[PDB]
């Protein structure tokens, strides 16, 4: 590999540099406009997400088939963690794009979405209480990529250990005692279980919206969604 | 012929 | 409360003592089974395990300190995740199979007998494999299970639950240090254990979809408690 | 509900 011989600062440097940009909405609400805006954005972010993933150390070392599988498993968790991250400094709101801040009130508009909006807002608030940092965030999202589909399968689990080592290095650099370090490592990784939950509930609502055919979906989004069932 | 298969290659 | 003042070793003793029993199935190899009745055995087993689980939860440090409404919510969110981690735990030493009960061992080529669920079977086998890979320990297992209980439904409502979760992290670390792991091995293993909960969460969400499908077909017997647990999702 | 009663029993 190569990911395994990077130092901790180099690993975080790599992940900071791979980071995708914050995109803007094609914006100039109801069920159709909500879903049309959101799925257009999701489609656009997905293309950037795919090129981000190839820049995650250790990722390109996998076979194309394993890369496909990990991205199909995790793409919604990754869009969600990004959304919740963007939204931190905007309490009670979700920043889908800098020109598209949405209240839970607009989540009502779509059938079944207010439940997901509330879970996302909770996650964001939780990230805020914990004072989550950017360096930690990029580690978490890389962890999601490598971990989420990893069971349907060593190098990859060694890569995950390298990222753990990296998170700990960031917290120690930031001054935390050893005990604050393992407690905070635990708090962060537990949040990934809730991000998983949100992704599964979101995927189910995406399929439901696919079926109700309220909005046409991009072929890419259809294939990302299809891979889940 | 998955789109993702192409986009991971480009 | 009394939970926050427990030491690591007291925490571990508490949890080990609250361990529910492994129950038997009414499986009989003499009897033919359809995919339906084979599933009835599993749902029947889950229903009995649930009654034990509810009384085990009462003995998890910090749980009884919560209001009834919050206990209800936490159990409704986590019940299938907890049944599943227990099954994977029981199946550890039986590679390629799931030990639903001592008298009921199913390999994954028997899990095709039911449609749409062989993939759930595969994910459980994948998880039991991972436990084996890591040599998961009984004391780590009970910590993990209590984490699921307190954590799963925590962001769909409290500072108390988070203080208890921190105690369990402390307990996990203590267990790893006392097994002689380096500090680096301890944080790595901590992360390895906690990342499992993401997979266990996925399986539960996917099983819940198969549970709902099963109910809609009204082929397999589901008990009144299972019906209400499902409904909570 | 059933869980409610099991818990407070």
UniProtKB/Swiss-Prot annotation, chain B:
Localization per record: Nucleus
Position of sequence motif LXXLL motif 2: 4-8
Post-translational modification: Acetylated.
Oligomer status and interactors: Present in a complex containing NCOA3, IKKA, IKKB, IKBKG and CREBBP. Present in a complex containing CARM1 and EP300/P300. Interacts (via C-terminus) with CREBBP. Interacts (via LXXLL 1, 2 and 3 motifs) with RORA (via AF-2 motif). Interacts (via LXXLL 1, 2 and 3 motifs) with RORC (via AF-2 motif). Interacts with APEX1. Interacts with BMAL1. Interacts with CARM1. Interacts with CASP8AP2. Interacts with CLOCK. Interacts with DDX5. Interacts with ESR1. Interacts with HIF1A. Interacts with NCOA1. Interacts with NR4A1/Nur77. Interacts with NR4A3; potentiates the activity of the NR4A3.
Disease implication from the record: Chromosomal aberrations involving NCOA2 may be a cause of acute myeloid leukemias. Inversion inv(8)(p11;q13) generates the KAT6A-NCOA2 oncogene, which consists of the N-terminal part of KAT6A and the C-terminal part of NCOA2/TIF2. KAT6A-NCOA2 binds to CREBBP and disrupts its function in transcription activation.
Function: Transcriptional coactivator for steroid receptors and nuclear receptors. Coactivator of the steroid binding domain (AF-2) but not of the modulating N-terminal domain (AF-1). Required with NCOA1 to control energy balance between white and brown adipose tissues. Critical regulator of glucose metabolism regulation, acts as a RORA coactivator to specifically modulate G6PC1 expression. Involved in the positive regulation of the transcriptional activity of the glucocorticoid receptor NR3C1 by sumoylation enhancer RWDD3.
Similarity comment: family membership: Belongs to the SRC/p160 nuclear receptor coactivator family.
Record's protein name: Nuclear receptor coactivator 2
Species whose genome carries this gene: Homo sapiens (Human)
Species classification: Eukaryota, Metazoa, Chordata, Craniata, Vertebrata
Curated annotation (Swiss-Prot), chain C:
Residue numbers with lipid attached (S-palmitoyl cysteine): 143
Outcome when changing residue 143 to A: Loss of hormone binding capacity and temperature-sensitive loss in DNA-binding
In-chain residues carrying the UniProt-annotated modification Phosphotyrosine: 223
Known tissue expression: Widely expressed. Not expressed in the pituitary gland.
Residue ranges of the region described as Interaction with AKAP13: 1-233
Signal peptide positions (record): none
Mutagenesis / variant outcome for changing residue 82 to C: Loss of transmembrane localization, no effect on peripheral membrane localization. Impairs activation of estrogen-induced activation of NOS3 and production of nitric oxide. No effect on binding to ERES
Posttranslational mods: Phosphorylated by cyclin A/CDK2 and CK1. Phosphorylation probably enhances transcriptional activity. Self-association induces phosphorylation. Phosphorylated by LMTK3 in vitro. Glycosylated; contains N-acetylglucosamine, probably O-linked.
Domain NR LBD: 7-233
Cellular localization per UniProt: Nucleus; Golgi apparatus; Cell membrane
Disease: Estrogen resistance: A disorder characterized by partial or complete resistance to estrogens, in the presence of elevated estrogen serum levels. Clinical features include absence of the pubertal growth spurt, delayed bone maturation, unfused epiphyses, reduced bone mineral density, osteoporosis, continued growth into adulthood and very tall adult stature. Glucose intolerance, hyperinsulinemia and lipid abnormalities may also be present.
Family the entry assigns: Belongs to the nuclear hormone receptor family. NR3 subfamily.
Function of the protein: Nuclear hormone receptor. The steroid hormones and their receptors are involved in the regulation of eukaryotic gene expression and affect cellular proliferation and differentiation in target tissues. Ligand-dependent nuclear transactivation involves either direct homodimer binding to a palindromic estrogen response element (ERE) sequence or association with other DNA-binding transcription factors, such as AP-1/c-Jun, c-Fos, ATF-2, Sp1 and Sp3, to mediate ERE-independent signaling.
Protein name, as recorded: Estrogen receptor
Organism: Homo sapiens (Human)
Swiss-Prot record, chain D:
TM stretches of this protein: none
Subcellular location, record wording: Nucleus
Modified how: Acetylated.
Motif placement: LXXLL motif 2: 3-7
Organism superkingdom: Eukaryota
Disease: Chromosomal aberrations involving NCOA2 may be a cause of acute myeloid leukemias. Inversion inv(8)(p11;q13) generates the KAT6A-NCOA2 oncogene, which consists of the N-terminal part of KAT6A and the C-terminal part of NCOA2/TIF2. KAT6A-NCOA2 binds to CREBBP and disrupts its function in transcription activation.
Similarity section: Belongs to the SRC/p160 nuclear receptor coactivator family.
Purpose of the protein: Transcriptional coactivator for steroid receptors and nuclear receptors. Coactivator of the steroid binding domain (AF-2) but not of the modulating N-terminal domain (AF-1). Required with NCOA1 to control energy balance between white and brown adipose tissues. Critical regulator of glucose metabolism regulation, acts as a RORA coactivator to specifically modulate G6PC1 expression. Involved in the positive regulation of the transcriptional activity of the glucocorticoid receptor NR3C1 by sumoylation enhancer RWDD3.
SUBUNIT field: Present in a complex containing NCOA3, IKKA, IKKB, IKBKG and CREBBP. Present in a complex containing CARM1 and EP300/P300. Interacts (via C-terminus) with CREBBP. Interacts (via LXXLL 1, 2 and 3 motifs) with RORA (via AF-2 motif). Interacts (via LXXLL 1, 2 and 3 motifs) with RORC (via AF-2 motif). Interacts with APEX1. Interacts with BMAL1. Interacts with CARM1. Interacts with CASP8AP2. Interacts with CLOCK. Interacts with DDX5. Interacts with ESR1. Interacts with HIF1A. Interacts with NCOA1. Interacts with NR4A1/Nur77. Interacts with NR4A3; potentiates the activity of the NR4A3.
Listed name of the protein: Nuclear receptor coactivator 2
């Amino acid at each position: 590999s190569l990911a395994l011989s990077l130092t901790a600062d180099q690993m975080v440097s790599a992940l900071l540099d791979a980071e995708p940009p914050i995109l803007y909405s094609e914006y100039d609400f109801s069920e159709a406009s909500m879903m049309g805006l959101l799925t257009n954005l999701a489609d656009r972010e997905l293309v950037h997400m795919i090129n981000w993933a190839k820049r995650v150390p250790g990722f390109v070392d996998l076979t194309l088939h394993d890369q496909v599988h990990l991205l199909e498993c995790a793409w919604l968790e990754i869009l969600m963690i990004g959304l919740v991250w963007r939204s931190m400094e905007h309490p009670g709101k979700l920043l889908f794009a800098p020109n598209l801040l949405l209240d839970r009130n607009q989540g009502k508009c779509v059938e079944g979405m207010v439940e997901i909006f509330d879970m996302l807002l909770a996650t964001s608030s939780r990230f805020r209480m914990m004072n989550l940092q950017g360096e930690e965030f990029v580690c978490l999202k890389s962890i999601i990529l490598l971990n989420s589909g990893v069971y349907t399968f060593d190098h990859i689990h060694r890569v995950l250990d390298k990222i753990t080592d990296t998170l700990i290095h960031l917290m120690a650099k930031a001054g935390l005692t050893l005990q604050q370090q393992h407690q905070r490592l635990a708090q962060l990784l537990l949040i990934l279980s809730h991000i998983r939950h949100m992704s599964n509930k979101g995927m189910e609502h995406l399929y439901s919206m696919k079926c109700k055919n309220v909005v046409p979906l991009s072929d890419l989004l259809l294939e990302m969604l299809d891979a889940h069932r | 012929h998955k789109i993702l298969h192409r986009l991971l290659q480009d």
